[PDB]
Motif scaffolding. Structure first.
Motif, PDB file in Angstrom:
ATOM      1  N   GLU A  31     -25.957   3.513  17.364  1.00  0.00           N
ATOM      2  CA  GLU A  31     -27.138   4.308  17.686  1.00  0.00           C
ATOM      3  C   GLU A  31     -26.812   5.124  18.938  1.00  0.00           C
ATOM      4  O   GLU A  31     -26.596   4.565  20.012  1.00  0.00           O
ATOM      5  CB  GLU A  31     -28.366   3.406  17.894  1.00  0.00           C
ATOM      6  N   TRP A  32     -26.749   6.444  18.791  1.00  0.00           N
ATOM      7  CA  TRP A  32     -26.297   7.297  19.884  1.00  0.00           C
ATOM      8  C   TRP A  32     -27.451   7.776  20.758  1.00  0.00           C
ATOM      9  O   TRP A  32     -28.473   8.231  20.255  1.00  0.00           O
ATOM     10  CB  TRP A  32     -25.535   8.511  19.341  1.00  0.00           C
ATOM     11  N   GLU A  85     -23.267  -5.057  23.366  1.00  0.00           N
ATOM     12  CA  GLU A  85     -24.642  -5.155  22.894  1.00  0.00           C
ATOM     13  C   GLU A  85     -25.033  -6.611  22.658  1.00  0.00           C
ATOM     14  O   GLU A  85     -26.148  -7.017  22.983  1.00  0.00           O
ATOM     15  CB  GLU A  85     -24.832  -4.322  21.621  1.00  0.00           C
ATOM     16  N   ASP A  98     -26.233   2.910  27.740  1.00  0.00           N
ATOM     17  CA  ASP A  98     -26.286   3.971  26.736  1.00  0.00           C
ATOM     18  C   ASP A  98     -24.920   4.189  26.108  1.00  0.00           C
ATOM     19  O   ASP A  98     -23.898   3.768  26.656  1.00  0.00           O
ATOM     20  CB  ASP A  98     -26.777   5.275  27.379  1.00  0.00           C
TER      21      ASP A  98
END
Ligand SMILES: N#C/C(=C/c1c[nH]c2ccccc12)c1n[nH]c(N)c1C#N
Ligand SMILES: N#C/C(=C\c1c[nH]c2ccccc12)c1n[nH]c(N)c1C#N
Length: 334
Positions: A31-32, A85, A98
């Motif tokens: 997920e960018w 993550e 991020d």
């Protein structure tokens, strides 16, 4: 006749009972975030596979660190992302804030929380006995957490422990060599910095586990309480094992090799020679004695063992009396 197999004596099957998605990083879908949220300010350093910058999040003016990844196997990038993550929010684990990319060139970068670090070459000179105990305890919390989550760091060393000393804030960083533990898996021994490589890596024993990180941690402890950084200073990987043998002794080394039926390179036994096990007290001098205690030496002795199965776990280590005063301080009413 090959080497005797081994498995971790703790957290052996953590990944086994997880959903495949937890450890199957190859299938992870990134997920960018938005590249334009960040502005690069200053280059901090350069890895072999990355360039590291101090940056600012322009939506809130907070400092961050941006690591731009050079062209490399996508598999490697996905492994680091999945691990970061999985561990996010864990004690003293660097926060991945991020993941962004140039939307045209696809050149990706990881964005981390900023730590206002004091370089260890400066900081360690000034650390007190209590400071060392405290920060060792913080590193142990990170290692017990990542091990309990089925992950080996595999590059524990002072450069990968960021410390904001005035806020007593520690983060374990650079998870680029980290890997999921699966029992019976034969791992690449080309991990960790030379000075922090465990005996298993130096003798090419591939079926290692979380306990590799505990060796590296013991090397850090020795370097801090004895004011000798690095503690085991080899000139190459072969000589690295010689440096260890000169302290731990050759009899326990050959006992280790024998137990696991490890085949040593012929060259080794000529350069290993014969060495008695040295007393840890031998490394205490007037200039470091204020950092050394019976508890420190007992704890260090229980980390730096040839046999990876004989080393303290991170959890066992946090119980050691070395940390008695630290544990009371952490018992926070808040
Ligand atoms: N300047 C410059 C570069 C900028 C970026 C490429 N992706 C990014 C993602 C987020 C933030 C910056 C960049 C760059 N792209 N590729 C390299 N090797 C670079 C370097 N340094
Ligand atoms: N190199 C590097 C990293 C941080 C720093 C290096 N010099 C510094 C000097 C002052 C403040 C932070 C850093 C870093 N690498 N990976 C992370 N998550 C990091 C953070 N924070």
């Amino acid at each position: 006749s090959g080497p005797v197999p081994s498995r971790a004596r703790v957290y052996t099957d953590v990944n086994t009972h997880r959903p495949r998605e937890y450890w199957d990083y190859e299938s992870h879908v990134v997920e960018w975030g938005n590249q334009d949220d960040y502005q690069l300010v200053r280059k901090l350093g350069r890895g072999k596979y990355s360039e590291v910058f101090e940056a600012i999040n322009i939506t809130n003016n907070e400092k961050v660190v941006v690591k731009i990844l050079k062209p490399v196997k996508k598999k490697k990038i996905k492994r680091e992302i999945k691990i970061l993550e999985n561990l996010r929010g864990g004690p003293n684990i660097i926060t991945l804030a991020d993941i962004v990319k140039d939307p045209v060139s696809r050149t990706p970068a990881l964005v981390f929380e900023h730590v206002n670090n004091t370089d260890f070459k400066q900081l360690y000179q000034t650390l007190t006995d209590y400071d060392i105990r405290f920060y060792m305890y913080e590193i142990l919390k990170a290692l017990d957490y990542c091990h309990s989550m089925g992950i080996m760091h595999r590059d524990v060393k002072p450069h990968n422990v960021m410390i904001d000393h005035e806020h007593r804030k520690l983060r374990l960083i650079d998870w680029g060599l980290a890997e999921f533990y699966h029992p019976g898996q034969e791992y690449n021994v080309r991990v960790a910095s030379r000075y922090f490589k465990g005996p298993e890596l130096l003798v090419d024993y591939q079926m290692y586990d979380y306990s590799l990180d505990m060796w590296s941690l013991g090397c850090m402890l020795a370097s801090m309480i004895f004011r000798k950084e690095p503690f085991f200073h080899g000139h190459d990987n072969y000589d690295q094992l010689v440096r260890i043998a000169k302290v731990l002794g050759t009899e326990d080394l050959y006992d280790y090799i024998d137990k696991y039926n490890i085949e040593l390179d012929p060259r080794f036994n000529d350069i290993l020679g014969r060495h008695s096990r040295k007393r840890w007290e031998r490394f205490v001098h007037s200039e470091n004695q204020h950092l050394v205690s019976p508890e420190a030496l007992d704890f260090l002795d229980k980390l730096l063992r040839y046999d990876h199965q004989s080393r303290l776990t991170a959890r066992e280590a946090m119980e050691h009396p070395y940390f008695y005063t630290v544990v009371k301080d952490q018992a926070r009413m808040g």
